[PDB]
Point group: C3
Chain length 333, copies 3
């Protein structure tokens, strides 16, 4: 009986950060309430100042990561303010029935709705907008995120021993298809409704103009690099709602990887690079052994270094020469 | 001694349906005879009335699914009527030797041949035409199907307990590369021999013009949606002879997935989306928990909703509110 | 203490061959010294005589395969002669820290350097050049190879029983992006520095002009096909530094496949085709059961047969009719 369950309200954080949660559940099954407000906005996505009309959950690309446990109930209230122009909805890959909630959540601007579903399967999953006849348009404009459904006893390794992470980050990778003039210059629009027909043409090439982490080229660099220390255990959640990607930590590994993101499966060990199919969320666990700068990339290196799919980790701590050392520094021969 | 074995003749059905078979073998090893007749024909592949010259096994795209057990012998008689214009053959990914049968099955129009091979490895596999110097041309014109080699004791889960399916469907996904005029209009040809040189140019872009299930855009919709009921266990066999795909059931999951299609491996559990490499057949097992319409798609959503890679399931039965419910229907805010 | 360890010098061979090594280590942990000399050169990559400026490790595409055991130390001396024009470096996916060695190995022409790292994780891994701001350029010009880190007790099957291979081959697959004139003709340059800006434009289409094994179209054919005999156990190491590939042996299988190349994981069994993500090395083990010609391909068949990703195996020995036979040879109907 659902009225007898505990309720908890969770206030969501902006990616790549993740809202507070427990790995091992310290309570029984709850009804966990979240609220998201849809926000259509102008977004500057590269260093040349290219501008798209983004469709966002809670004003970010990607949408924020929601974290529950297995057999909790998720109760999302979804708000479309009348300052938006389009009909929107939500489809949870984590849910069972009604096109993932899509059929039940259709909100015109100035409407709201509340959905409940039981999270019956543990793993990281994609959520995304999916209105009838305009699904790729909304998803490739940034209207996607993820949800993590932890097992009630947390994560385990390929042996079934606990794996406890010290930090967790969420990396949403997004393929944009910006329309181009005859000479290849990026076009600009005043309304998202304006862009539509050119967007369909652009998408149909299957060749994105940009692929970025956290909504912009260099969004996870320098000032905004991800931080860790040597000896910390980090979980990186990574989603792609529409296209395949192949993550890789430069100077590191995926010690434990769930490449298709479902925790009832044993992880893959010692991965250099892993494939996350389009429409999936995955997770990699790593213990940092060395300090310094790392690059985290999609390892189609054209997609990384030309199109924008690259971020940084800056890691404090002691250097270990047994692992690696320069015997002879670069010198005249 | 092969003359002492039982023979059985099987008459094949048109996809997405599958010919009658036993999951658990009720006989010892058999020689199972099938016949296929090749058919070059005109095919209308989208709602605008675009026409290709298809090269088919038994008049369908995809070719029909053949079902045997491990260590049965497959004896295929292959017929190329003199109403066709090209040389054809067959390559079974399930077989060992002679380029999968390709080297032994080269038939000019008005020829026939019979091949036998032992099915030594259990799984779903691709078969396809592969004549010398024209292989992608024949495969991307629709000349591919699959064969399922069941273990003699049927399917098992990640624990080795029986998995029994109630229904089974075969979804062949096909990338077409239709040649285009200077303005991007789809060209038309009278003979397949006419199309050849433009086809090579089209294929070389690596960008398909269409990606469809069962030979046409919307072939598995409305009138022709796949059916099931709540509580039935359904096996979906899905092949792609030439290009990667990433299936996903909208509103559902792959409870048990063999993404690369080989049953001696344990399945992957609780998959939202899975990757089937080009040149492979895979299989997903699902128990429907809710009634209603589901969409089954390639989850590059551009490929699904713009290019044609989408089908429907319509599922009869009782709704379960514990799994999902609308708390507040979309309403004025 | 590292000064007390044995040293061994290994002289590397040109792919697809692999330098002598032991599967089971007959010594304790060693410091294994290799030397590579970088070589920028002109390369003819197809039968039309298209010419690129290749950037190579030791004069080949791919670079040679290095073979060590787990917890050996790799000590590479890297030489950039002053007959080259670019700055280069090396990034080992097998190593931990300093962007895989990249940060420590930056050598201008006429410089050298020596790197040591401990190989702490068993598997096949990619190595490649990765200088700041020009990474895809160097990698797609051919500046990549692989290293195999065997477990000290060699390979095991999904049960943990020994797997011993009789032969081993290394197949490096390379995507080239040759720049094209307005009419689609392949341009030619005198210096690699000349090509740069057109290369960036070419790469950004994400559509390679060629995809080849061992540096050229038909490099592993006829004269240069890979050899084996019926009953031999062959290990095929296959890498792609930048783009996904889907290997497949025509007429055969991957009896045991590590598709992401890491040996602490159990292999996948009976694979028809497997996915190697871009930025990864994988390995397939097969026992040949039949003699004759086999084709080994990327099973996007356009990529194989139009763009160059196809090689041959020619296999001596006795034919087994129980596995496959022609009952009726192609004949008039
Ligand atoms: O080794 N990273 O490109
Ligand atoms: O959740 N399906 O696109
Ligand atoms: O069956 N090989 O294309
Ligand atoms: Cu939307
Ligand atoms: Cu989806
Ligand atoms: Cu054919
Ligand atoms: Cu094939
Ligand atoms: Cu270089
Ligand atoms: Cu790399």
């Amino acid at each position: 009986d659902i009225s007898t369950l505990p309720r908890v309200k969770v206030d969501l954080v902006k990616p790549p950060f993740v809202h507070a949660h427990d790995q091992v559940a310290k309570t029984g099954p709850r009804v966990v309430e979240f609220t998201m407000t849809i926000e259509e906005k102008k977004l500057v996505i590269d260093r040349e100042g290219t501008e798209i009309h983004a469709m966002t959950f809670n004003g970010s690309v990607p949408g924020p990561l929601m974290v529950v446990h297995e057999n909790d109930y998720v109760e999302l209230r979804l708000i479309n303010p009348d300052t938006n122009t389009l009909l929107h909805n939500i489809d949870f890959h984590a849910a069972t029935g009604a096109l993932g909630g899509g059929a039940l959540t259709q909100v015109n601007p100035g409407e709201e709705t509340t959905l409940r579903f039981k999270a019956t399967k543990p793993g990281v999953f994609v959520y995304h907008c999916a209105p009838e006849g305009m699904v790729p348009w909304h998803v490739t404009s940034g209207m996607n995120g993820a949800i993590m459904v932890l097992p009630r006893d947390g994560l385990k390794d390929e042996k079934g021993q606990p794996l406890t992470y010290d930090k967790i980050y969420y990396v949403g990778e997004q393929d944009f298809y910006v329309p181009k003039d005859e000479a290849g210059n990026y076009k600009k629009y005043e309304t998202p409704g304006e862009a539509y027909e050119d967007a369909v043409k652009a998408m149909r090439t299957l060749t994105p103009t940009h692929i970025v982490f956290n909504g912009a080229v260099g969004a996870l660099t320098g000032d905004h690099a991800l931080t860790a220390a040597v000896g910390e255990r980090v979980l990186v959640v990574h989603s792609q709602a529409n296209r395949d990607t192949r993550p890789h930590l430069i100077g590191g590994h995926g010690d434990y990887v769930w490449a298709t993101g479902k925790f009832r499966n044993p992880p893959d060990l010692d991965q250099e690079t892993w494939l996350i199919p389009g429409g999936t969320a995955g997770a990699a666990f790593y213990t940092f052994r060395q300090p310094g700068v790392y690059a985290y990339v999609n390892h189609n290196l054209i997609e990384a270094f030309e199109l924008g799919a690259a971020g940084h980790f800056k890691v404090t701590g002691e250097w270990n020469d047994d692992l690696m050392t320069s015997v002879v520094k670069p010198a005249s021969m």
